[PDB]
Amino acid sequence: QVSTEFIPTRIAILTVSNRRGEEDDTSGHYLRDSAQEAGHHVVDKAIVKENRYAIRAQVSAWIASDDVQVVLITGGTGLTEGDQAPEALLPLFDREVEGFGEVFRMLSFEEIGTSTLQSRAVAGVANKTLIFAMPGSTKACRTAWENIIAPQLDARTRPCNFHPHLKK
Amino acid sequence: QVSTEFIPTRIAILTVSNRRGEEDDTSGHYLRDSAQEAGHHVVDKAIVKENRYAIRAQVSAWIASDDVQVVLITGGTGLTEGDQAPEALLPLFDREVEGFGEVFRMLSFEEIGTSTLQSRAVAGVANKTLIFAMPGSTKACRTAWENIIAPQLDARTRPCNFHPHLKK
């Protein structure tokens, strides 16, 4: 159940934004850098429009692929008309990992207050592919990565983590 | 809106099968051939394993594409554990086109009898992409194309057809 050595996971990163460009993709850059620095391999990275169909095409390709084990998504979880991440992803999940959105909103409430109601972070599993959708804010991503995701992607984490159950 | 002339549609064909290859794919061929012998353009074709995720990845790309207006799928609508076409697609739909399944099972009863209950044909629309999922049997494909889809894809058909609702 628990390994004595760090075991790298294969991660794909996605930025949902109509204007965001590689240059001004701060959350995308943050997740890539944090992942690489922790020892994981980032095998793909893309930026898509806030479009529900563009999100489904990229994420479904990764769900069906042999190598992507984890998908990290930033953006598109807001309450506007164009925020489509949750709508695009929920129907693709085999199962939802409810502890993620709850613990994230809990930590986020202490950090930014009632503004945490403005985001709909959610995680799920499809074809053994782990998918985490977080807000576009870089601080939100740091809160999610350091206190929640990184620990669970680390094979040495007691009492248990995702390692044994990931694709391949 | 009914045109006075014929207007070609950009169609993508998909075969769902674990064994079938391009050579022994009678249904894929029939559809490409029929599609063309009617004046439409077949912009893409592919074969996927009877796998819910493989189907989702390929069909989501076509839905998000600028060129594919119509998708035709043969296979996987059965009642076995491996038949996943309906399961794969239903959640990708913006709207379901009930008329298809009901009509197809109607004309099919008149030809194969109660064996019509062994198929779960269905169609829907997603990002203006028209999606038809029919049985693997070439005879079924014939009944669907000739008696239901072909006419509906003919812009001259009255009282109405899909012409005005296809993605530009």
Side-chain angles (χ1 to χ4, degrees):
Chain A
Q1 174 99 283
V2 174
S3 158
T4 56
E5 56 187 61
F6 173 84
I7 301 179
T9 68
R10 274 119 47 194
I11 299 170
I13 295 194
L14 178 70
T15 294
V16 176
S17 177
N18 292 144
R19 67 186 85 169
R20 253 77 177 66
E22 270 306 329
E23 344 305 301
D24 64 44
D25 174 11
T26 327
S27 298
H29 290 331
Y30 168 75
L31 293 174
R32 177 198 65 211
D33 293 348
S34 297
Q36 302 185 311
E37 166 178 1
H40 298 290
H41 311 313
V42 170
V43 304
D44 205 352
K45 178 179 186 302
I47 301 185
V48 300
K49 299 307 180 180
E50 311 169 20
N51 179 283
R52 149 191 316 208
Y53 314 98
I55 297 169
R56 277 172 185 171
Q58 182 59 278
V59 176
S60 294
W62 293 332
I63 285 171
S65 73
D66 291 307
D67 73 322
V68 183
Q69 298 177 128
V70 180
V71 180
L72 301 180
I73 315 179
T74 171
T77 80
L79 300 180
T80 88
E81 183 65 2
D83 292 315
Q84 296 283 299
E87 288 77 6
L89 308 162
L90 297 198
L92 300 183
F93 295 164
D94 287 331
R95 313 168 184 291
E96 171 178 347
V97 179
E98 298 114 282
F100 179 71
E102 295 171 8
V103 172
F104 174 73
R105 277 179 293 269
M106 202 202 302
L107 293 170
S108 180
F109 187 61
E110 299 177 0
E111 151 170 277
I112 62 173
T114 64
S115 297
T116 81
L117 295 211
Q118 299 291 153
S119 292
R120 302 173 290 151
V122 65
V125 182
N127 194 211
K128 295 188 167 266
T129 317
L130 228 188
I131 297 167
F132 297 93
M134 59 207 99
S137 160
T138 302
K139 169 152 72 186
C141 295
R142 290 208 190 75
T143 292
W145 179 257
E146 299 174 344
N147 304 290
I148 315 180
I149 302 157
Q152 281 302 111
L153 299 190
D154 193 326
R156 299 168 293 192
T157 300
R158 241 198 187 67
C160 55
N161 52 260
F162 287 104
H163 171 241
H165 308 338
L166 295 176
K167 196 183 295 179
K168 310 306 156 180
Chain B
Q1 174 185 180
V2 180
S3 179
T4 70
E5 321 293 283
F6 176 80
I7 303 167
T9 70
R10 277 106 62 186
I11 304 169
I13 300 176
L14 182 71
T15 297
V16 178
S17 171
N18 287 146
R19 300 186 60 181
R20 275 62 171 58
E22 275 297 315
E23 48 200 295
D24 47 327
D25 183 11
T26 307
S27 281
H29 301 329
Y30 165 73
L31 291 172
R32 175 203 52 195
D33 292 353
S34 290
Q36 306 190 303
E37 289 171 3
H40 296 116
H41 304 282
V42 166
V43 284
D44 195 359
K45 168 165 157 70
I47 304 179
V48 295
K49 300 301 179 181
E50 287 236 354
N51 182 103
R52 169 192 308 197
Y53 314 99
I55 303 181
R56 280 179 184 165
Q58 181 54 263
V59 180
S60 293
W62 293 332
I63 288 174
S65 77
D66 271 309
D67 71 308
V68 178
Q69 295 178 133
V70 182
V71 170
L72 297 177
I73 313 180
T74 171
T77 73
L79 307 185
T80 70
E81 183 64 2
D83 299 302
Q84 303 289 309
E87 287 77 5
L89 307 160
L90 283 161
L92 308 177
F93 296 166
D94 283 334
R95 288 172 297 296
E96 177 169 9
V97 184
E98 293 105 295
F100 177 66
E102 303 178 10
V103 165
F104 173 79
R105 281 183 280 278
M106 194 193 299
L107 318 180
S108 187
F109 182 71
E110 298 184 1
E111 157 184 348
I112 71 175
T114 69
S115 296
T116 194
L117 304 208
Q118 302 298 139
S119 285
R120 297 176 290 152
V122 72
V125 181
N127 190 209
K128 297 182 169 300
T129 303
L130 215 196
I131 302 162
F132 295 98
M134 65 204 88
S137 127
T138 303
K139 183 155 72 175
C141 292
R142 291 204 175 89
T143 306
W145 176 261
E146 298 171 0
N147 290 18
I148 310 170
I149 304 163
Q152 280 311 91
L153 291 187
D154 186 334
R156 311 184 302 273
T157 295
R158 287 185 162 76
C160 50
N161 56 296
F162 287 114
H163 164 54
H165 306 181
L166 291 175
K167 84 172 65 163
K168 294 301 178 182

